């Protein structure tokens, strides 16, 4: 009659560890096509009904929301990969899951997982030491300031639809990173706006901030769109004649009183409307719509206004001209105003776009992209995001290691020799760790269409011949040196990946039982 769990499912034993292994393979198998710049993209449909397609492991695992506890640990460690580094969230989960696959036959042989986890901790400790030996300090050495940024951005943009126009896109990509303080570089500070229509090579770089120009209200052919030093005013409240929401009940029996209450509704609005002119600002920006009466009164005094501007764009305006948002039109102070070097409304893409240009106080920028289709430009923007992260980390981190299979093979190469000196179960565990490091160069060839059998075996040949820098060429299929091909990643990525993947692996291998309470 009595029950221990009161109907709360709890399972233990070696079968629970196997169930944790199958969960790590399921998460790995989903991220395998998303590994590498040429890797395939995953189709994810969230319960929010927003269909997204991306290859970035961070965004992928955040939108899946896997309830499985052992599989959720691989998601939590991927968010740590997005925190400590921010790049490589796809490879850290695949490598951690591969450690679960290589530890599966050891569980059937009767080898305890604690000796397996202890073997990885000694393997990573030797692996990080080899990465420090593979860390090459380079700043001005055999490279200039311009060639270091350009030649590294061309490789990230290679094998893409932008390959032919890459010469123009590297110039805007390098100038985008140099437009910000090299001490603190944030990808969020670089704005990117997609412009439908037009040629890809005609894209422009804006030093200031731009937005969509969502103003739908009539009164056009006025309010000149080109200003030299406009005074930008950030507004909150609603200046439209006929208001959005509220109202009032007024009972009057006279005809002159009918026109009076209509003029009263006008005078109450015109009061705060005239206070905008008393500030003497040429640009009026508000997150709420600016009605026909307001845009007409601004047209007579030659004041430009745009309503219903996104909040994300208004925050960049504050970071551009150094202004501030004031709630009312009365108390507006002079320091809340701001000014740019040039203001123009561009018709590029058969659509009107307001832009601020030449802001000396701007901590952010905006880069416009053009193309024949909105989906193609989105691929250009994401291929640019991969190029920005390489250019950004090049200045922030001067210690680099050869990527694209180069470093992955050298770490796996030496640990096979280090395992010869160690005897016992730890020898087969280190050999399994070095074998688990072979999944990274493998999936890079499988996702790009290259043959995994020939290229990997040929890579194991020349790399064993005394040259440590041989990677996998992503352009023309062959083995080659990525140090010459300029495939570069900082040493902190390879160190934090081996530390985070083994950590998440050690947390899952240490779980004998999963207790889930229902309620």
């Amino acid at each position: 009659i009595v029950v221990l769990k009161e109907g709360t499912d709890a399972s233990q034993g070696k079968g629970q560890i196997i169930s944790n292994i199958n969960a790590c393979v399921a998460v790995q198998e989903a991220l395998k096509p998303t590994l590498g710049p040429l890797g395939s993209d995953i189709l994810i449909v969230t319960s929010n009904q927003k269909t997204t397609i991306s290859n970035d492991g961070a965004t992928i695992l955040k939108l899946l929301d896997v309830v499985h506890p052992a599989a959720k640990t691989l998601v939590d460690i991927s968010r740590a990969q997005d925190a400590e580094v921010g790049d490589g969230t796809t490879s850290v989960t695949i490598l951690a899951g591969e450690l679960m696959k290589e530890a599966k036959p050891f569980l059937e042989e009767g080898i305890s997982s604690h000796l397996i986890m202890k073997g990885y901790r000694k393997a990573v400790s030797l692996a990080v030491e080899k990465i420090n030996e593979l860390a090459v300090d380079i700043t001005s050495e055999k490279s200039s300031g311009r060639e270091l940024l350009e030649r590294c951005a061309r490789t990230a943009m290679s094998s893409k639809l932008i390959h032919n126009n890459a010469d123009f896109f590297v110039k805007m990509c390098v100038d985008a990173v140099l437009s910000l303080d090299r001490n603190d570089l944030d990808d969020k500070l670089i704005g990117i706006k997609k412009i439908p229509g037009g040629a890809m090579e005609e894209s422009l770089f804006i030093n200031g901030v731009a937005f969509k120009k969502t103003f739908s209200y009539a009164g056009f052919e006025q309010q000149p769109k080109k200003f030299n030093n406009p005074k930008i005013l950030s507004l909150n409240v609603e200046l439209e004649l006929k208001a959005e929401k509220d109202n009032a009940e007024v009972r009057v029996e006279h005809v002159e009183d009918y026109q009076a209450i209509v003029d009263a509704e006008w005078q109450l609005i015109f009061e705060k409307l005239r206070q905008v002119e008393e500030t003497g600002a040429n640009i009026v920006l508000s997150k709420l719509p600016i009605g026909d009466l307001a845009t007409q009164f601004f047209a007579d005094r030659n004041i430009f206004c745009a309503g219903r501007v996104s909040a994300d764009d208004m925050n960049r305006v504050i970071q551009a001209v150094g202004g501030s948002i004031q709630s009312t039109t009365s108390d507006i102070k002079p320091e809340h105003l701001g000014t740019c070097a040039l203001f123009e409304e561009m018709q590029i893409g058969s659509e009107r776009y307001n832009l601020f240009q030449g802001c000396p106080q701007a901590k952010t920028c905006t880069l416009l992209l053009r193309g024949g289709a909105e989906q193609v430009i989105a691929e250009v923007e994401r291929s640019l995001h991969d190029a920005i992260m390489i250019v950004k980390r090049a200045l922030q981190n001067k210690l680099i290691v050869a990527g694209g299979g180069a470093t992955e093979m050298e770490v796996s190469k030496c640990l096979r020799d280090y395992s010869k000196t160690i005897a016992g179960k730890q020898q087969m565990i280190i050999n399994a760790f070095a074998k688990a490091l072979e999944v990274i160069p493998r999936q890079l060839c499988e996702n790009a269409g290259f043959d995994a059998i020939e290229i990997l075996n040929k890579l194991r040949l020349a790399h064993s011949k005394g040259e440590k820098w041989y990677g996998v060429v992503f352009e023309t299929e062959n083995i080659g040196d990525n140090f010459a091909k300029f495939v570069w990643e900082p040493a902190l990525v390879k160190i934090n990946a081996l530390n985070s993947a083994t950590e998440a692996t050690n947390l899952i291998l240490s779980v004998d039982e999963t207790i889930t309470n229902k309620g």
Partner: protein, 528 residues
């Protein structure tokens, strides 16, 4: 969270399910691709039944949960803004590339090699069409409008327009010329207002430069025409959001009248309000008073003595359309009236249509405007919407013909010439591209075979017949017999498509085919 209601398709069984799912959606509109294509019955969620062959309507009316098919809807959505006539053609062409891609997957070829194969296939086919294209406006202006007028007659032959098509084809030519400039050469469809109403026939549909508000002028005694007013500048009208009358409260009325004295006092307020409003019209020099709300009958009586015709109950969006044609402004109140804010037109009159009791109005210009209004009529609702969208389809063709003078004859001709050129160059490439280019040429052959299946002809026999005529003799444009003629030549038959339209059709089709193959995993959750 919520492990249930989550399905995952990956690897082996995913690639086969994606192609067959896109094939089922494409097989819907295959038979609807052509001038002879078959209609479909579409039922709105409100219960209305409509019958049309338009691909933009069928794909939008169809509600589907397939994410791969949603990419097909986004494919036709982006091209509809660019072109609009390639809706059903791009999906069948993209699915034909998917059907050939599925065959290459079964042969052991990776999807990345297939995507890179179709990429080099498009770049080679574009260069072949760029050499064989011809120009129209490069010859003569009268000859341009000759080919321009006959090009609209071709696109209107698949619709009920075909009877009166000679009239609607001239409408597509005249409507574009007015919204375009010789130096700018920019054709914008927003500058052309498409408007239609039920009743009459398609023979009564005219083309007028101006706007029509469909109003009887609020009173029969007011004249049916408006004079220039003794040497004034055109005819000045007012665009206002307030009616001509004593204004009324929008909450409650409940006016209490104690005796006859209070009723006679409101007579003076109502009479003096009339004089204050009419004086604002005479000082501003305005002829016709156009307002958003109706007018008082006693107010219209004084307008008869002052020779001031008035128009009441005009929509807000209709008020903005007058300010575009007449270069006017929307004026909130009577005291804001000024000569610069009044719309300046040539004249205003009420035009009677046959015995119909509608009796709309027409505001004219007599000089080139920034907007035009296409007037469309029909014996039935669906007839009006068909003739309106068929004329809009011709406007999209004229827009591409002016933007790009390079033209090709596209029906059944282009897919064969593209296939014959790629098939010959497939042997010289010698690699994975050889299977990709051979399947690319076979996927292009789907379009002319589909047209032959919709016209009642052998898709295999007609396709090869078009090939042998373009090989043994010379490379030219010889298309499918769908419309009919003594021969299959598309030149003398005057069936033409824009070269920039054919290039964007084969581009976006190859682009999405690479995006569908770009997806190696599909994870779809439920609705929480």
């Amino acid at each position: 969270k919520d492990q249930g209601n989550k399905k995952r398709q990956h690897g082996l069984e995913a690639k086969k399910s994606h192609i067959l799912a896109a094939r089922s959606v494409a097989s819907i509109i295959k038979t609807s691709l052509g001038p002879r294509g078959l209609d479909k019955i579409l039922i709105s969620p409100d219960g209305e039944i409509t019958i049309t062959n338009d691909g933009a309507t069928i794909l939008s009316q169809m509600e589907l949960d397939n994410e791969i098919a949603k990419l097909l809807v986004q494919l036709s959505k982006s091209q509809d803004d660019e072109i609009g006539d390639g809706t059903t053609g791009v999906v069948v062409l993209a699915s034909a590339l998917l059907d050939q891609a599925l065959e290459l997957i079964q042969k052991g070829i990776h999807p990345i090699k297939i995507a890179n194969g179709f990429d080099e296939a498009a770049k080679l086919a574009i260069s072949k069409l760029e050499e064989t294209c011809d120009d129209i406006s490069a010859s003569n202006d009268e000859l341009f409008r000759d080919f321009l007028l006959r090009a609209a007659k071709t696109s209107l032959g698949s619709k009920i327009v075909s009877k009166d098509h000679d009239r609607f084809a001239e409408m597509a030519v005249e409507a574009v010329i007015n919204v375009m400039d010789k130096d700018r050469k920019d054709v914008d469809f927003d500058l052309i207002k498409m408007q239609g109403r039920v009743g009459g026939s398609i023979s009564d549909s005219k083309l007028i430069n101006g706007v029509i508000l469909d109003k009887d002028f609020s009173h029969p005694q007011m004249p049916k025409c408006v004079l220039p007013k003794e040497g004034s500048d055109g005819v000045k009208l007012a665009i206002l959001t307030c009616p001509f009358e004593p204004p009324k409260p929008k909450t409650k009325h409940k006016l209490d009248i104690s005796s006859v004295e209070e009723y006679q006092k409101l007579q003076t307020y109502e009479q003096d309000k009339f004089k204050e409003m009419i004086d604002d019209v005479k000082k501003a020099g305005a002829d016709v008073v156009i307002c958003q709300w109706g007018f008082d009958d006693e107010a219209n009586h004084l307008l008869l003595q002052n020779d001031l015709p008035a128009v009441r109950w005009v929509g807000g969006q209709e008020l903005e359309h007058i300010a575009i044609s007449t270069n006017g402004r929307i004026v909130p109140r009577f005291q804001d009236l000024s000569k610069d804010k009044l719309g300046t037109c040539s004249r205003i009159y009420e035009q009677e249509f046959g015995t119909t009791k509608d009796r709309m109005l027409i505001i004219e210009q007599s000089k080139e405007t920034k907007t035009v209004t296409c007037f469309v009529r029909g014996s039935n609702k669906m007839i009006v919407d068909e003739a309106e969208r068929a004329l809009h389809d011709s406007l999209c063709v004229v827009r591409n013909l002016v933007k790009d003078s390079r033209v090709v004859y596209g029906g059944g001709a282009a897919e064969v010439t593209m296939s014959l050129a790629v098939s010959e160059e497939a042997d010289k490439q010698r690699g994975i591209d050889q299977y990709a280019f051979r399947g690319f040429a076979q996927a292009l052959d789907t379009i002319p075979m589909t047209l032959a299946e919709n016209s009642g002809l052998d898709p295999i026999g007609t396709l090869s017949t078009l090939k042998s005529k373009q090989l043994k003799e010379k490379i030219s444009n010889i298309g499918v017999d769908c419309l009919g003629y003594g021969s299959n030549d598309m030149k003398e038959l005057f069936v033409v498509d824009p070269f920039i339209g054919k290039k964007q059709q084969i581009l976006l089709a190859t682009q999405l085919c690479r995006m569908i193959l770009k997806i190696d995993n599909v994870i779809i959750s439920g609705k929480d």
